[PDB]
Scaffold this motif. Structure first.
Motif: not given
Ligand SMILES: [Mg+2]
Ligand SMILES: CCN1C[C@H](C)n2c(c(O)c3c(=O)n(Cc4ccc(F)c(Cl)c4)nc(C(=O)NC)c32)C1=O
Ligand SMILES: CCN1C[C@H](C)n2c(c(O)c3c(=O)n(Cc4ccc(F)c(Cl)c4)nc(C(=O)NC)c32)C1=O
Ligand SMILES: [Mg+2]
Ligand SMILES: [Mg+2]
Ligand SMILES: [Mg+2]
Ligand SMILES: [Mg+2]
Ligand SMILES: [Mg+2]
Ligand SMILES: [N+]
Ligand SMILES: [N+]
Ligand SMILES: [Zn+2]
Ligand SMILES: [Zn+2]
Lengths: 184, 368, 368, 184
Positions: D13-14, D70
């Motif tokens: 994820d970021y 996601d």
């Molecule tokens: Mg994300």
DNA sequence: TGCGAAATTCCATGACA
DNA sequence: ATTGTCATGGAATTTCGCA
DNA sequence: TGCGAAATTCCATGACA
DNA sequence: ATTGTCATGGAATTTCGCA
């Protein structure tokens, strides 16, 4: 008295002036007494300096117990005496005007002069390059008195350049008339 | 393939598949229950591609390739299939090292006479001295007697000048040299032919072959070094001294100096040997001929336990002479034409040229 | 001297001069009649100068110096006088080669755990690739797991940048390196101290000491070479592939890959081992701890027949690291202070500094 | 069903944008599912390109069977899909607006965010250099649920940097008032 | 309880500037 | 204050498959 | 007809780009 | 079409001096 040996005595002398060859004018002649082996060195002058420079080469190969010469200036200089002393070489001079060697050396020196004269006519200027072959000739020339060449006496073997063609060594009628014309 | 694996599934016996194990189907794949666990049996037509994938991960040899494969698969004689691919991987064959030693060295006969054979070589570049940079070293094979000549370059022209001065004394039958440019030029060949001298070249990049002169180079540098300690390296004026010094040094195994072996008597140098003072020159030359033939000769040493020896028709690879960074150290495979001796061979190189080569610059191609 | 030689001439017996030979006078010199011939006996006060003259002709060792002397002279125990001078010739001592092998290598214990000890080193300069010229290689001592980092220079700053990325994963107790400038800088020492890492340096010019990483360098170059065959040497983009390729290659003696030794389970790479699929992670880590302790360990090989071993107070000489042309290969003699182990010593060097040095860069000074 | 293992699943994820640090603005977060081990990568953008460049580094060390994220654009691009396919990685997306990991990962991701926030106040610009120490902290942080840190689970050994000082991780009254002033 | 062949282990060779 | 290593492929040895 | 020590021989080591 | 060598100094072995 112990028998004579190589390196017992080297007989040295100058030949020239000669027609310039690669800027050289003289030949220092070295003959071993016992073997009759000849070394030749081209010089620019019969000076102590040229002698030392030449013999420095020879004596980096073998050193004589005695060097013998006439009373040339180059050989009687104190510089040449310092050189000989440094190297443990006793110097020996013949009385002035009266040169003595041995029969063997006298004859060899005669051959050298005669062989040089023969080859310098026609090409009086190319003798520098010819020095190596002159030496091989002289050194692989049979000795009437002993049964052997200088090569054989020095090394104890046959040579790979046997000079079976013992030459005339005399000037042909062509060489006589064009030698009297070269200095005319 | 799908053929063999069918018969196997319906309980039939196929050769190479031990009958004592249960072979089943699962996820559309033939599997077997091996002591180590359950492995997949791929169809024969798949096997080459599997070996290749395993091998190419890191270009691994036999066992490390095998271990990867055995993780997932089993089939009869996997290593035979592994080795088959290793023998066909050009990158492995030309990059990997050898693990086989050469056979024991030859100890060639000492030349019988002074002037039979000269060994020659250049040393340098050395620090400039009087504007000279190299030394031509000439060593008589029989005697070890040595001549030194300073040169500005390791060139034919400088070699010819030096040899002209040397050959004033005597002409040798053979001159032996490595294949440096100075010695392989046609100018130098002309010069040799003119004088009846036979030129004999070392196999390339194998200075052992010129061992006589190479070994003298060492002593020459060693003495030059000692003499120059605490002074600037002005070596030109020392060459003559070194020459004379070495030519008059005893070899403890021989009990003679090279000068003695050449002349049979010392000249007027320090500590000159006096033993033949009462002999005539003729008696002296007689004893000398005897000494020359009774000199100690070394014999070929025992082979290492894992030496290899060249056989006609065998695939072998020449060592790359001056390999570039990240480039293979071995040329492509080639074929032994002739076995000149157990340490020297002629090969046909794929180009295909004839090359005479030292076994030390060869390895046998692995995996046939 | 003239004392001893007098008594000897009038038939008295002096020790060391065998009574059975006739000693006489001639040319003002004492002579003796030996089986080999008649030799001069110089007075004791002359003998040193004679030995020295003989020796200096070519800076010869025992037997070749002796042979020159025996040409003219005899006296009791000449070799004892010869050896005395050889031990005092600075030029011989610092120029001559050793003829004694080092004792057999140590095989240090494998670090017990991953991250106990890192071995690091630079490879290069390589051909430029993306403007990079070097590779920092980091090898975990226990596992062999390796990290690769391209750099423009073998510098502290590039090492620090690379190690910051690596130490994100874990901090090692010790980092071992040779004494290249990158690793010996105080900047790098600060960096290590800041993080509780102990820096451990190889003896100088002895890459065997960093053998773990040195050996990995070989495989790294070997794989890079194979991959680059017939293409230009664009190696930068290959480093990651090589890293992964090597970390997942089996060592045939161990039967494990460095990745396996580090994690106890293969990741999602080709031919992943599936043997622990049914164990829990805990069972897996349990088997792993067991594997790590039962790994094969090599033992010290047999000594060579002519090895030497360092003893406190002994005179020894350090090898010159990068000797210039025509310059001695050995430093002046120095003294063994401590013997850290049979292959490592501390010496006091005449300057006099303390230096920790490999026995491979030492020879024992000859002739005491 | 076989027990869970390291490299079974990486959760990615970021985080960002962040205050620029050495020209970086985002952090790619990678957490191993089974061990809770965290890898962090600074990027300049949450692009497929920056993701590929970062994961190329991680996957030159270990390759996951499954990556889970996601539905960020960077992860759903066909470029990122080509990348995963090349490497034999199966990609896994949570349904949009509804992110699911596991309890372990959710908690770890919470810690990462909280630990970052704590260290960026006071020096919002020096986080690039701090990444290494953040990772060591996260990875040598004890797991209440299992008896072990991620380090121990990944390597099967104790670490040389044990973080015995489990910190507050909360903002002190100073940090609260000067964080509301930094963006004001 | 022993055979022939396949599998595994052994280990010298050589290269890490 | 520190210290050789280990992939490689023929050979040697051990184990396997079957009886 | 055997001892202790000196002499000689043996030979692994290493360096010739 | 070509091919290792040999100074070195401790150790090992042989010889010497004397009885
Ligand atoms: Mg994300
Ligand atoms: C260009 C022609 N050429 C080919 C090669 C360059 N070469 C030439 C030489 O004179 C030597 C030389 O003296 N040494 C030293 C050396 C090394 C090990 C030994 F056993 C021995 Cl008796 C000598 N090495 C090489 C060499 O092959 N290095 C890789 C060499 C030569 O002139
Ligand atoms: C300047 C600090 N420095 C000192 C020297 C230069 N050095 C350094 C290296 O990394 C290496 C190296 O890898 N190799 C290759 C090699 C050769 C034989 C072996 F057994 C192994 Cl194990 C490795 N050699 C040297 C060297 O000492 N040459 C004479 C070397 C280093 O960095
Ligand atoms: Mg005159
Ligand atoms: Mg050469
Ligand atoms: Mg050479
Ligand atoms: Mg290094
Ligand atoms: Mg290195
Ligand atoms: N021969
Ligand atoms: N150890
Ligand atoms: Zn391959
Ligand atoms: Zn000396």
């Amino acid at each position: 008295d112990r028998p004579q040996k190589p390196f017992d005595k080297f007989f040295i002398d100058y030949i020239g002036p000669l027609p310039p060859s690669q800027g050289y004018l003289y030949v220092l002649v070295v003959v071993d007494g016992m073997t009759g082996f000849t070394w030749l060195y081209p010089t620019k002058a019969p000076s102590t300096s040229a002698t030392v420079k030449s013999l420095n080469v020879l004596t980096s190969i073998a050193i004589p117990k005695v060097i013998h010469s006439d009373q040339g200036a180059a050989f009687t200089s104190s510089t040449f005496a310092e050189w000989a002393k440094e190297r443990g070489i006793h110097l020996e001079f013949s009385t002035p005007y009266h040169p003595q060697s041995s029969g063997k050396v006298e004859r060899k020196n005669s051959d050298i002069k005669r062989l040089l004269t023969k080859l310098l006519v026609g090409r009086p200027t190319k003798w520098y390059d010819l020095l190596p072959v002159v030496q091989l000739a002289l050194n692989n020339t049979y000795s009437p008195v002993l049964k052997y060449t200088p090569h054989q006496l020095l090394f104890g073997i046959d040579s790979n350049t046997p000079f079976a063609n013992q030459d005339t060594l005399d000037l042909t009628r062509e060489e006589e008339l064009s030698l009297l014309q070269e200095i005319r | 393939l799908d053929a063999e694996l069918d018969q196997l599934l319906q309980g039939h016996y196929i050769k190479g598949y031990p009958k004592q194990y249960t072979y089943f189907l699962e996820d559309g794949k033939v599997k077997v229950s091996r002591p180590e666990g359950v492995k997949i049996i791929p169809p024969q037509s798949d096997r080459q591609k599997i070996v290749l994938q395993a091998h190419n991960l890191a270009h691994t040899g036999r066992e490390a390739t095998l271990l990867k494969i055995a993780n997932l698969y089993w089939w009869p004689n996997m290593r035979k299939d592994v080795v088959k691919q290793l023998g066909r991987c050009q990158q492995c064959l030309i990059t990997n090292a050898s693990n086989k030693a050469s056979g024991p060295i030859l100890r060639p006969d000492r030349p019988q006479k002074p002037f039979d054979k000269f060994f020659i070589d250049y040393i340098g570049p050395l620090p400039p001295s009087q504007g000279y940079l190299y030394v031509l070293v000439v060593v008589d094979g029989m005697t070890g007697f040595t001549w030194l000549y300073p040169t500005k370059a390791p060139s034919t022209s400088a070699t010819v000048k030096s040899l002209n001065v040397l050959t004033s004394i005597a002409i040798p039958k053979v001159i032996h040299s490595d294949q440096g440019a100075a010695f392989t030029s046609s100018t130098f060949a002309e010069w040799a032919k003119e004088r009846g001298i036979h030129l004999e070249f070392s196999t390339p990049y194998h200075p052992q072959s010129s061992g006589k002169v190479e070994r003298k180079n060492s002593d020459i540098k060693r003495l030059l070094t000692k003499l120059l300690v605490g002074r600037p390296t002005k070596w030109y004026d020392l060459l003559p001294v070194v020459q004379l010094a070495l030519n008059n040094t005893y070899s403890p195994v021989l009990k003679y100096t090279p000068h003695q072996l050449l002349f049979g008597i010392d000249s007027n140098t320090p500590f000159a040997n006096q033993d033949t003072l009462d002999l005539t020159r003729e008696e002296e030359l007689s004893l000398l001929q005897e000494i020359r033939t009774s000199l100690y000769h070394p014999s070929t040493p025992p082979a290492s336990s894992r030496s290899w020896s060249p056989v006609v028709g065998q695939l072998v690879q020449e060592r790359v002479a001056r390999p570039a960074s990240l480039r293979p150290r071995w040329h492509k495979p080639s074929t032994v034409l002739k076995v000149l001796n157990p340490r020297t061979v002629v090969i046909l190189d794929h180009l295909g040229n004839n090359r005479t080569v030292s076994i030390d610059n060869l390895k046998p191609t692995s995996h046939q």
